[PDB]
Amino acid sequence: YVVKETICKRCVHNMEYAVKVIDKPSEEIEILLRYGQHPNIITLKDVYDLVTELMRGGELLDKILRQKFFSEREASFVLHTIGKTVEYLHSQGVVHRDLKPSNILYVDESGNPECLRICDFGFAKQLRAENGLLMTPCYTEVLKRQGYDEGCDIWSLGILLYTMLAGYTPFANGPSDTPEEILTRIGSGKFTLSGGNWNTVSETAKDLVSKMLHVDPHQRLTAKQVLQHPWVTQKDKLPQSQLSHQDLQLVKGAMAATYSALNS
Ligand code: NA
């Protein structure tokens, strides 16, 4: 490898790759080695004492809230792509726990949904027995946290969906928002789905967001249940008019602030 400039940093063989250098680690290497093969999970090329595929298309919001023509039809292909990958991960007993939009990148500058990749597994954990051998939800405190952590991966896709639809985040108005104001909004379980831009959004889209962001995490939807919703299944039925959106930096800043509030 011929180590080049930082974006963690790019390299060569003769082809270009990315390298994520970490300070003193094992759970991420294991998830990437057993599941990296998935088209929409970043492929691990090598591990030394980690080499991955170089993402050349930037983060999701950067494309969808800028150049790319973006309507409900396009938003549906994004949720499906990511929803299917998350459904696959949950079936294998893998929870992500950092499924914020900045961890969803494009391999190329095409904006094609197939090019989407979930890129960071540093917060990800595998459901283990105790010995511990790997366990899936299929073979039934550890199981209760997994259920809670699955619902947190769905909630995160819920805020992604909301952002894609509204062109703003459900619980933060900008980077200036404090944990106090964001945490109060989350805890209330209330969010706008009416007025202005929301008035031209489909009733099916509003139905899914409500079900994904539901106050009661028990009345919330599973990854399998999201993908079976008409908004995802019935693509022909969706509006194809450009979705309105706020300034990109403002939206990105609102997301960073939201996750900063949650991680605290
Ligand atoms: Na892959």
Side-chain angles (χ1 to χ4, degrees), residues 1 3 6-8 11 17-21 25-29 31-33 35-36 38-44 46 48-50 52-62 64-65 68-124 126-129 131-139 141-142 146-189 191-217 220-223 225-264:
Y1 296 92
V3 216
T6 45
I7 60 99
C8 210
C11 53
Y17 290 92
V19 164
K20 184 185 172 183
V21 167
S26 186
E27 200 87 330
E28 184 186 329
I29 296 224
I31 287 158
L32 253 27
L33 275 167
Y35 316 105
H38 194 284
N40 313 294
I41 293 172
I42 188 146
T43 333
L44 191 67
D46 240 287
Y48 296 131
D49 166 53
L50 56 94
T52 58
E53 55 171 353
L54 184 63
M55 303 287 95
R56 294 179 199 276
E59 306 156 10
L60 172 67
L61 311 185
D62 292 65
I64 71 171
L65 311 169
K68 184 174 177 54
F69 176 90
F70 195 70
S71 75
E72 278 190 56
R73 182 203 42 222
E74 279 75 30
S76 200
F77 275 90
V78 172
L79 194 66
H80 197 324
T81 305
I82 303 138
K84 125 238 253 148
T85 319
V86 171
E87 187 200 17
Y88 175 71
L89 282 162
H90 286 179
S91 82
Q92 298 296 315
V94 184
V95 284
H96 192 90
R97 267 136 75 277
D98 205 26
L99 221 45
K100 59 181 177 178
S102 60
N103 294 330
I104 305 156
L105 281 89
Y106 275 110
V107 62
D108 61 22
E109 314 189 64
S110 81
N112 296 332
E114 58 270 39
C115 303
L116 254 7
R117 312 275 194 259
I118 311 184
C119 298
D120 176 281
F121 288 81
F123 263 67
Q126 280 169 299
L127 183 79
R128 272 167 160 91
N131 328 357
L133 56 163
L134 320 162
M135 313 303 283
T136 67
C138 201
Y139 195 72
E141 286 295 280
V142 208
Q146 189 81 354
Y148 163 89
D149 292 324
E150 283 176 345
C152 283
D153 276 2
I154 279 46
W155 187 86
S156 289
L157 289 185
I159 75 177
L160 172 61
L161 179 49
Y162 186 107
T163 311
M164 296 198 288
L165 290 165
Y168 61 87
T169 78
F171 312 110
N173 302 123
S176 266
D177 288 21
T178 65
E180 295 104 318
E181 58 195 342
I182 303 169
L183 294 180
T184 299
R185 287 170 197 150
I186 299 168
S188 75
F191 49 93
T192 113
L193 272 182
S194 39
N197 61 328
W198 280 109
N199 292 176
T200 78
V201 168
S202 69
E203 215 55 62
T204 358
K206 296 189 231 152
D207 183 57
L208 184 63
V209 275
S210 316
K211 276 153 183 182
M212 291 193 72
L213 292 188
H214 203 273
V215 309
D216 180 67
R220 209 168 279 165
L221 260 45
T222 61
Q225 283 181 309
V226 165
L227 302 155
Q228 298 280 57
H229 190 278
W231 194 75
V232 177
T233 70
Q234 287 143 61
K235 258 116 179 181
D236 184 46
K237 261 85 221 86
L238 304 178
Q240 310 178 348
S241 49
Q242 176 66 238
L243 286 163
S244 105
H245 64 67
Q246 277 178 26
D247 170 73
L248 179 74
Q249 298 319 115
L250 200 66
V251 175
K252 288 219 283 183
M255 274 293 182
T258 309
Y259 282 89
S260 190
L262 290 167
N263 305 345
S264 69

